[PDB]
Amino acid sequence: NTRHIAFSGNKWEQKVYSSHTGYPGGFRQVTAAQLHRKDPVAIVKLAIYGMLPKNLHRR
Amino acid sequence: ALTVGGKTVSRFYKPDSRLEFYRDLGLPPKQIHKIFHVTDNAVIKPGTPLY
Amino acid sequence: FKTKGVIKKRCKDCYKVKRRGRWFILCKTNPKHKQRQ
Amino acid sequence: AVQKMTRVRVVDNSALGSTPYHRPPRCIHVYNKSGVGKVGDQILLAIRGQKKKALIVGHRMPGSRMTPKFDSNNVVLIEDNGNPVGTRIKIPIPTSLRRREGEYSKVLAIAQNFV
Amino acid sequence: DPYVKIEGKDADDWLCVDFGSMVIHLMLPETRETYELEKLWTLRSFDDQLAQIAAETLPEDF
RNA sequence: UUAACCAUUGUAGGCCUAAAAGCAGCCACCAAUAAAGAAAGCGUUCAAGCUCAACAUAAAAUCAAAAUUCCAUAAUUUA
RNA sequence: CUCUUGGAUCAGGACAUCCCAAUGGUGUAGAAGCUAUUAAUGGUUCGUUUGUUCAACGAUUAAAGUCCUACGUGAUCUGAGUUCAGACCGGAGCAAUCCAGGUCGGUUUCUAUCUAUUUACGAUUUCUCCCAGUACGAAAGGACAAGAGAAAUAGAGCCACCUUACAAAUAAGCGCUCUCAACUUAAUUUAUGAAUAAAAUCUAAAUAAAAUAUAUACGUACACCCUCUAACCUAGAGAAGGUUA
Numbered sequence: 132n133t134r135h136i137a138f139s140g141n142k143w144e145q146k147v148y149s150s151h152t153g154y155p156g157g158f159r160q161v162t163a164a165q166l167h168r169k170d171p172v173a174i175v176k177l178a179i180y181g182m183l184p185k186n187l188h189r190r
Numbered sequence: 191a192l193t194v195g196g197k198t199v200s201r202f203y204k205p206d207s208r209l210e211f212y213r214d215l216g217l218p219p220k221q222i223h224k225i226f227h228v229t230d231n232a233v234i235k236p237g238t239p240l241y
Numbered sequence: 242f243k244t245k246g247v248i249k250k251r252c253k254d255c256y257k258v259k260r261r262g263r264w265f266i267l268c269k270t271n272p273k274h275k276q277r278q
Numbered sequence: 279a280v281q282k283m284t285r286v287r288v289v290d291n292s293a294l295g296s297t298p299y300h301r302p303p304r305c306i307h308v309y310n311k312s313g314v315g316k317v318g319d320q321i322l323l324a325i326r327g328q329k330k331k332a333l334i335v336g337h338r339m340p341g342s343r344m345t346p347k348f349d350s351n352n353v354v355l356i357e358d359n360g361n362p363v364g365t366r367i368k369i370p371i372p373t374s375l376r377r378r379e380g381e382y383s384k385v386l387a388i389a390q391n392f393v
Numbered sequence: 394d395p396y397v398k399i400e401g402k403d404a405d406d407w408l409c410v411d412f413g414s415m416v417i418h419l420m421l422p423e424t425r426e427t428y429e430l431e432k433l434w435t436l437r438s439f440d441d442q443l444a445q446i447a448a449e450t451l452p453e454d455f
Numbered sequence: 456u457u458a459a460c461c462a463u464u465g466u467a468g469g470c471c472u473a474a475a476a477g478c479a480g481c482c483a484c485c486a487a488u489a490a491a492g493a494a495a496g497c498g499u500u501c502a503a504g505c506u507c508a509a510c511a512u513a514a515a516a517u518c519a520a521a522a523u524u525c526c527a528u529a530a531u532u533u534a
Numbered sequence: 535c536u537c538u539u540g541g542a543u544c545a546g547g548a549c550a551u552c553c554c555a556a557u558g559g560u561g562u563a564g565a566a567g568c569u570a571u572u573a574a575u576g577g578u579u580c581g582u583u584u585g586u587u588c589a590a591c592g593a594u595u596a597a598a599g600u601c602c603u604a605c606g607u608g609a610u611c612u613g614a615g616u617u618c619a620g621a622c623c624g625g626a627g628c629a630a631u632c633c634a635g636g637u638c639g640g641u642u643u644c645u646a647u648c649u650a651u652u653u654a655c656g657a658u659u660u661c662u663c664c665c666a667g668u669a670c671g672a673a674a675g676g677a678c679a680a681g682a683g684a685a686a687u688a689g690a691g692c693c694a695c696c697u698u699a700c701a702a703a704u705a706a707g708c709g710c711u712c713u714c715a716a717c718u719u720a721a722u723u724u725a726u727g728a729a730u731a732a733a734a735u736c737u738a739a740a741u742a743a744a745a746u747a748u749a750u751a752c753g754u755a756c757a758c759c760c761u762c763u764a765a766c767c768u769a770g771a772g773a774a775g776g777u778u779a
């Protein structure tokens with residue numbers, strides 16, 4: 132049911148996710164709602180990734 | 191998807207894998223294969239010549 | 242739509258509204274009086 | 279292919295072009311997005327310490343098949359309003375000028391021979 | 394049947410319109426007489442102004 | 456301290472101001488009426504005209520929490 | 535009282551926007567203009583010094599934007615100056631010499647060890663015609679939007695022709711061909727409607743719509759599992775890759 136998660140407050144419209152392709156002009160910033168539309172699993176996965184220890188065993 | 195081949199070629203200098211694949215279809219080998227995106231209504235049986 | 246630090250009513254007919262996250266003073270009689278914050 | 283500083287021949291009966299001068303006329307500007315001028319293009323000419331508008335009617339560079347290639351770069355002087363400076367032309371003029379986008383009727387009237 | 398452009402608006406005295414099989418030139422009396430367009434087309438190769446023009450040859454600059 | 460309803464008159468008060476009439480001034484600033492300032496504003500060449508306050512009728516109730524590419528992840532209640 | 539910058543080449547980025555785009559107000563009739571909001575999409579020319587204390591002039595353009603990046607950039611290149619060894623004038627010093635004064639001439643080399651990097655995409659602008667000499671306006675004058683055609687630059691390819699070479703079967707441009715879709719928005723403008731007794735209100739109330747530049751929801755391209763003595767090749771530095779009565 133990762134599609135049915137809920138956000139408190141106005142986080143849907145205020146939380147931005149950032150990524151860079153690596154080429155000039157490759158910086159993209161997207162809001163939480165937009166990312167949830169494209170991928171129904173990305174939000175939950177990103178939260179878990181951040182909380183794990185930053186080492187090789189994380190992957 | 192459908193795969194199409196053309197331009198019959200010699201059989202002598204080819205790997206066995208390719209020769210086995212063509213023997214099943216009962217045709218001599220072709221130089222090149224490519225893929226085409228086709229809808230269900232437009233599907234055509236394998237082995238049919240095109241013009 | 243002059244954007245000003247302080248928005249002030251300029252005539253009796255001027256009225257105030259809260260649209261799309263900002264404060265507006267709108268007067269129909271005098272479109273000159275329209276302002277945004 | 280007329281460019282800045284190209285030397286051109288005035289094929290016209292106007293006194294300004296006809297009178298001999300120690301310097302031949304030279305192009306100063308081409309009224310195109312590109313700098314290259316072909317048949318049917320206006321240019322800015324420097325004549326006898328003066329500037330005048332002019333029109334290209336022939337050149338030595340090859341074109342598409344079935345069109346005439348001349349031996350010299352020929353030009354006609356044009357007034358600011360667009361009326362021809364001269365009153366007669368004797369050298370043959372191409373017939374492609376009739377349909378090309380632009381104002382060529384006035385020059386066509388004065389020209390006798392079309393090749 | 395194609396559309397037809399109007400030419401000579403820049404000029405204040407001479408206007409010409411080119412139809413498919415007809416050509417019409419309008420101008421003031423002073424402009425008409427100077428260019429004398431009737432003479433040329435009537436007398437195709439015998440025009441007086443054309444005869445005045447000549448040819449050029451020279452062995453050396455002298 | 457307010458949101459509802461309204462407006463008659465002595466006379467257009469003098470004053471070189473044509474006229475400056477509640478309103479340019481300029482001094483006075485009084486009158487009737489339940490209730491009406493020789494008027495708190497607009498606006499008229501001056502006048503007209505629009506308002507305010509009055510007439511009854513209602514109701515509510517001070518400061519403070521810029522130039523390479525965003526940058527831990529997240530979270531409102533268990534003594 | 536004094537005393538490092540230009541150019542070439544290739545550009546990365548900001549928005550405090552010059553042009554192209556969507557809008558509000560006007561002392562906005564039309565056409566021109568003046569001012570403000572939103573947006574970084576790609577673009578943003580060619581020549582020249584008689585006078586001008588960090589200026590000017592000619593011809594054009596839809597426009598010839600303002601800035602940051604140890605002058606962005608000299609182990610990629612180059613011109614002044616910092617600045618000397620020679621030599622002259624002008625002003626000083628008895629002289630040797632001197633000057634934040636004039637001028638002419640005048641020497642920096644690099645074989646790349648490490649990081650980093652070297653194989654697709656779905657376009658911008660201008661002009662003519664048409665609407666129409668219409669709308670508007672007393673006249674003078676003079677447009678929207680919608681439709682059509684031409685170009686120019688940018689990108690990707692190609693050789694029937696033309697042109698230039700090898701006085702070779704090929705390579706090139708000065709020759710020829712092809713270039714498109716928007717799920718997801720901002721300034722703004724409408725519709726229904728409470729707080730607030732309405733005939734109120736576009737709504738950081740619950741709702742329904744339209745509307746820049748962007749972009750990747752959506753497509754194209756790619757997909758194969760691979761014999762090899764050797765020879766040949768429109769494939770190539772090597773290796774790899776393709777072809778074999």
Ligand SMILES: [Mg+2]
Nearest residue numbers: 155545546547
């Ligand atoms: Mg750049």
Ligand SMILES: [Mg+2]
Nearest residue numbers: 549551572573
């Ligand atoms: Mg801005």
Ligand SMILES: [Mg+2]
Nearest residue numbers: 607608609610
């Ligand atoms: Mg360097």
Ligand SMILES: [Mg+2]
Nearest residue numbers: 620638639640
């Ligand atoms: Mg020397």
Ligand SMILES: [Mg+2]
Nearest residue numbers: 614638639640
């Ligand atoms: Mg020197």
Ligand SMILES: [Mg+2]
Nearest residue numbers: 617638639640
């Ligand atoms: Mg020197």
Ligand SMILES: [Mg+2]
Nearest residue numbers: 646647648651
């Ligand atoms: Mg290396």
Ligand SMILES: [Mg+2]
Nearest residue numbers: 665678679680
């Ligand atoms: Mg139109």
Ligand SMILES: [Mg+2]
Nearest residue numbers: 727728732734
């Ligand atoms: Mg209601």
Ligand SMILES: [Mg+2]
Nearest residue numbers: 726727734735
């Ligand atoms: Mg309403």
Ligand SMILES: [Zn+2]
Nearest residue numbers: 252255268274
């Ligand atoms: Zn107002």
